[PDB]
């Protein structure tokens, strides 16, 4: 370790999807769990912007798979919300909490169901996602499907 400058450069590298600087930075001991002002780790940024390889290299270097931002959202939330199927699987394989709730009681299943990611909804249920989980408003993933008028998702649930 050095001071705290390499951690910020790892965040920008993972955000900009540079597999190059990311592995060079952690070879120099960059904080793999360095967080930004909103509490996003490099695993958050890589999962949000869909960089599957960076998610991989980050996780083998000990990145906290269940880190939450200042509003309770985990990297699995982001990956499920924006339809990154490959990242959702590797996160769950590495022990991501499939029933993690953010500050609003919103689960990865709620987010995946809201944007209609059927494949991800199936993967989440396979790893044990609670089908009856409710958010702060009492809504389940089934209520989300009904409101969106997505009967194929409603059939799965």
């Amino acid at each position: 370790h050095h001071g705290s400058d390499l951690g910020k450069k790892l965040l920008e590298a993972a955000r900009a999807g540079r597999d190059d600087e990311v592995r060079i930075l952690m070879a120099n001991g960059a904080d793999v769990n360095a967080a930004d002002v909103v509490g996003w780790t490099p695993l958050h940024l890589a999962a949000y912007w869909g960089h599957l390889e960076i998610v991989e290299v980050l996780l083998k270097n000990g990145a906290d798979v269940n880190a939450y931002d200042t509003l309770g959202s985990t990297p699995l939330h982001l990956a499920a919300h924006f339809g990154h199927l490959e990242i959702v699987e590797v996160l769950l394989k590495n022990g991501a909490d499939v029933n993690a709730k953010d500050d609003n009681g919103i689960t990865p299943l709620h987010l995946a169901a809201n944007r209609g990611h059927l494949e991800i909804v199936e993967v989440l249920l396979k790893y044990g996602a609670d089908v009856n989980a409710q958010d702060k408003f009492g809504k389940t993933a089934f209520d989300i499907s009904i409101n969106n008028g997505n009967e194929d998702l409603a059939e799965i649930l």
Partner: protein
């Protein structure tokens, strides 16, 4: 030589970049038809609620004709724009004309804020300056005072009031009403008395605003506006902080009128300023921070995404301190502006204007502009978590670069356009033998606070969505309510939350909206929030979403060879992504 350009400027206070683009910028662009000699059109909408639309015309086009045609099309589109935008004024001016001179105003007694100084310049200096012979447009570095109502959500919840009630009460009790006359025509014949009726008049002081009656409690007690808000004269806007050698400053940007003599007008301005100085209050002094080697140069300041105004100020203060000590023999003044730079506006941008001593008194190559800015840039490379760059702008604008526009041609959206840009920039880096410094001219996406209102919960509780969005907007973004009279001069009234109640996500819970039944309902009852990324500065070119890309031809390569390469790389970008050349490359 430079082609004539007209710039449209509009303001949506408290609006994000996407809100500005989709309610103002797109609407105006769609109405820019029937204008003669238009070459191209470009615009940006940013997170400070600002949009600028620049229309560039063919060489030889009469700039007066161009401005009038643009302004007439804009005015016919005015009813299509949000009321909050119309109320700020949408200006249409000839651009591509830098200032004849910059006049700075400070107070050597240290007794005036920049808001106090700006209001003095607005009410006692600007109009006489604009009437000086040879003077065209004059821009104020600040604003006249506004009556600032700084709301307290704890007190408002205590008396079951919302910002909606505050805005309603101010419109009702700071009002100027036509009330008619006694004995007006047509009268009863034989009438002798003819007198105007005078009813409410605009309020004139913080004291009068403080006693605005919000409600009477059923036990007999009164709730006045001063019981739920702090009330002071202040600025219309707080995005920009100006300092002259560390002291608060305002001033004037003066442009030369078309067909007028430059030095004759400069002497007339100085002569007019000499007339005002006997009337200045104690401490107020005129300075000239940029007498356009050249004897002046600039220093750029850019901080990371999300960085605050206070952090930018610290870097600017370090920049000011370096020039006034390490270059005390060469530098006479540093005018530091916190809030905008070259790459756009925002709390994480700033720019410093440095004026040097007389060239005659700076002997030696080491005391010239080029050597000074090289030491400064080298010394500022130490400063962490900030990019600080010194340069002489005439020396940097002066013939090796290209100006590239990446264009969304098929409704792909901002995220997919960002990917296409990233693919092109990754490839451009693979040819360092031809292309160097290929970079976006704009800003990157930043985290934003996305708050979702739950429509079902609001309706079940009887909370109006308009009360919700007015409470959120007025408290956190501020609201122009109406006008008042400050020492005989009409000025604006703004409502906004006191700073300490609109800083962090947890502060959202401090704000309550009154339901139909009369209960106070917290924001946490009908809302949820999450972090997401979004653009702080959206760009458009010829009416389509765009991303500007600057770059240089490699040493030993021509500007045409570099452009040829860029076109080849662009030809292999995703479907629906197009390009165009602009500016120096058109």
């Amino acid at each position: 030589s430079a082609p004539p350009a007209v710039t449209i400027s509009a303001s949506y206070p408290g609006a994000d970049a996407k809100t500005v683009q989709d309610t103002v910028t797109q609407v105006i662009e769609q109405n820019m038809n029937g204008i003669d000699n238009l070459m191209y059109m470009s615009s940006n909408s940013d997170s400070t609620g600002t949009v600028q639309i620049t229309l560039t015309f063919e060489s030889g086009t009469d700039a007066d004709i161009a401005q009038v045609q643009v302004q007439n099309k804009l005015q016919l589109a005015m009813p299509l724009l949000p009321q909050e935008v119309q109320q700020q004024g949408v200006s249409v001016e000839k651009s591509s004309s830098s200032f004849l001179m910059v006049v700075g105003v400070i107070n050597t007694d240290g007794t005036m804020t920049q808001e106090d100084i700006s209001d003095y310049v607005a009410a006692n200096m600007k109009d006489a300056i604009s009437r000086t012979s040879g003077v065209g447009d004059v821009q104020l570095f600040g604003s006249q005072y506004a009556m600032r109502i700084w709301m307290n959500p704890n007190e408002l919840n205590k008396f079951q009031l919302t910002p909606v009630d505050v805005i309603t009460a101010i419109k009702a009790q700071n009002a100027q009403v036509a009330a008619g006359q006694l004995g007006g025509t047509p009268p009863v014949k034989g009438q002798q008395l003819n007198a105007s009726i005078i009813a409410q008049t605009r309020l004139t002081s913080t004291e009068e605003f403080g006693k605005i009656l919000l409600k009477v409690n059923q036990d007999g007690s009164r709730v006045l506006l001063r019981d739920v808000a702090k009330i002071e004269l202040g600025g219309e806007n707080y995005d920009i902080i100006a300092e002259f050698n560390g002291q608060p400053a305002s001033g004037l940007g003066i442009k030369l009128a078309t067909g007028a003599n430059a030095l004759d007008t400069a002497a007339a301005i100085r002569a007019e300023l000499a007339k005002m100085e006997p009337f200045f209050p104690s401490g107020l002094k005129i300075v000239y921070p940029y007498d356009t080697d050249q004897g002046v140069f600039m220093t750029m300041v850019q901080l990371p995404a999300g960085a605050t105004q206070e952090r930018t100020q610290k870097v600017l203060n370090e920049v000011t301190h370096y020039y006034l000590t390490k270059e005390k023999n060469n530098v006479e003044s540093v005018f530091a502006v916190n809030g905008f730079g070259f790459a756009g506006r925002g709390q994480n941008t700033g720019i410093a204007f440095v004026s040097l001593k007389d060239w005659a008194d700076r002997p030696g190559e080491e005391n010239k502009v080029e050597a000074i800015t090289m030491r400064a840039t080298r010394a500022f490379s130490q400063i962490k978590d900030a990019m600080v760059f010194a340069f002489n702008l005439p020396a940097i604008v002066e013939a090796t670069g290209f100006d590239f526009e990446l264009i969304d041609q098929a409704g792909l959206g901002h995220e997919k356009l960002t990917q296409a840009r990233n693919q092109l920039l990754a490839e451009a880096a693979k040819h360092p033998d031809m292309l160097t410094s290929v970079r976006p001219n704009g800003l990157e996406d930043t985290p934003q606070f996305k708050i979702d209102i739950d429509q079902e919960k609001a309706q079940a509780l009887g909370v109006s969505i308009n009360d919700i969005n007015t409470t959120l907007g007025a408290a956190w973004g501020g609201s122009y309510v109406n006008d008042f009279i400050d020492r005989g001069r009409v000025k604006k009234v703004y409502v906004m939350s006191e700073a300490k109640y609109r800083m962090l996500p947890d502060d959202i819970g401090d704000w309550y909206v009154r339901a139909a039944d009369g209960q106070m309902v917290p924001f946490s009852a009908f809302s949820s929030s999450r972090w997401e990324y979004g653009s702080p500065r959206l760009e458009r070119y010829n009416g389509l979403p765009s991303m500007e890309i600057l770059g240089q031809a490699a040493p030993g390569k021509s500007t045409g060879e570099a452009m040829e390469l860029m076109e080849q790389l662009a030809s292999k970008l995703p479907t629906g992504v197009g390009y165009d050349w602009t500016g120096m490359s058109y």
